[PDB]
Write a protein that binds this DNA or RNA. Structure first.
Ligand SMILES: *[C@@H]1O[C@H](CO)[C@@H](O[C@@H]2O[C@H](CO)[C@@H](O[C@@H]3O[C@H](CO)[C@@H](O)[C@H](O)[C@@H]3O)[C@H](O)[C@H]2NC(C)=O)[C@H](O)[C@H]1NC(C)=O
Ligand SMILES: *[C@@H]1O[C@H](CO)[C@@H](O[C@@H]2O[C@H](CO)[C@@H](O)[C@H](O)[C@H]2NC(C)=O)[C@H](O)[C@H]1NC(C)=O
Ligand SMILES: *[C@@H]1O[C@H](CO)[C@@H](O)[C@H](O)[C@H]1NC(C)=O
Lengths: 99, 99, 99, 102
RNA sequence: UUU
RNA sequence: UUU
RNA sequence: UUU
RNA sequence: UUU
């Protein structure tokens, strides 16, 4: 399915989403273990290891690096927020390595 | 139908609300798709394009610029939070173009 | 009942809670309208006016000033967070007018 | 059961989780009170964290110290500060924030 | 200041 | 420090 | 920029 | 680094 997480304290807050429904979902690092909703919210207490979610038979890995890139965008968007027409695009340009 | 989002990492965390219930909702860029509940919470993994949400036969467009204006208000409210009587209105005055 | 909100972009993210269940809840400025569970979460798009909630025939007002005090505590706890034994109480001492 | 909280305004936003289901959960300060299978997880808030987070869940007393919540916010804060170096930001923040760590 |  |  |  |  699709997994989206943002940082929360020392860990992460996540959503799993599948348009046709989430039938099973588990994680070695996060508090989710269920075997039909299309959205499931869960947390990960630490992100020392990357976020690993098994969802509908598919292994998903959201790297902690990827989470930090997303936090970078949030932080620099806020820093530039008196220029609201350009803040988000400026933050993406600074924060995403391969651009 | 009302849509409200705040920034979350690289994207947005959102709610769609309709007092008499949401009968259908979709988005080209956000994780929501329904073909009756008052409230639906969903996320948008990116806001490089503005948040476009279809709800109850209406096209809703929340500009990323509008989301950054709201983040500006949050950020400057916190900056000024030792002056809790005026911090919010000061933040609105700085952050909302025109005022 | 009990109402607790924190700041979210230009507005607030809130919860109402009542030990014996929430039978009625509404608000002139927040997206909540029910006419039975212990807890409901709702958002307020703006806090230019204080957050006013009617819950179980009781009128609840959380002042924006109060919200900002709470955000002060959050912000200065983060600022002092390399001293985790005293960061929270230090933030309360700086941020709460009656101390 | 398991309890994880992060700071929210003057208090905390929390989640409790038990693999076999949460049947009883209460708190001397947080807004949670359930008695009676049932759901694996419940979200609740605490309006203040002056006196740590104490949760009675499935007969066991859980205490998440405010100090621990602040270490966690330290990691969030320094990860953000270091976020232009996304390969190392989290590890750096842990190294700085977790007392005694080497 | 979510239109 | 949500009254 | 959640793969 | 939620014990
Ligand atoms: C959650 O809390 C409740 C109450 O605090 C616990 O209820 C307890 O349940 C056991 C059996 O499941 C009760 O024992 C039974 O007592 C009756 C007489 O009242 C007897 O006829 C039965 O044969 C059995 O011995 C126990 O009395 C009851 N406790 C109280 C205070 O009423 C429940 O077990 C808790 N669940 C978890 C997972 O902690
Ligand atoms: C989503 O639901 C709305 C609400 O019922 C639909 O709106 C009406 O749909 C009927 C069906 O064709 C039309 O005759 C009306 O003119 C519509 N009214 C309005 C105000 O939109 C809408 O068609 C539905 N759309 C989708 C894509 O499901
Ligand atoms: C809601 O319930 C209360 C308590 O029963 C009642 O007094 C009130 O009239 C109801 N409606 C509103 C709008 O408060």
């Amino acid at each position: 399915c699709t997994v989206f997480c943002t940082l929360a304290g020392p860990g992460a807050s996540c959503e799993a989403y599948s348009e046709n429904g989430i039938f099973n979902i588990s994680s070695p690092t996060c508090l989710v273990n269920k075997v039909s909703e299309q959205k499931i919210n869960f947390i990960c207490q630490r992100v020392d290891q990357d976020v690993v979610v098994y969802c509908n038979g598919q292994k998903k890995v959201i790297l902690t690096k990827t989470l930090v890139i997303g936090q970078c965008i949030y932080t620099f968007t806020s820093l530039f927020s008196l220029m609201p027409d350009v803040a988000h695009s400026l933050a993406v340009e600074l924060c995403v390595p391969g651009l």
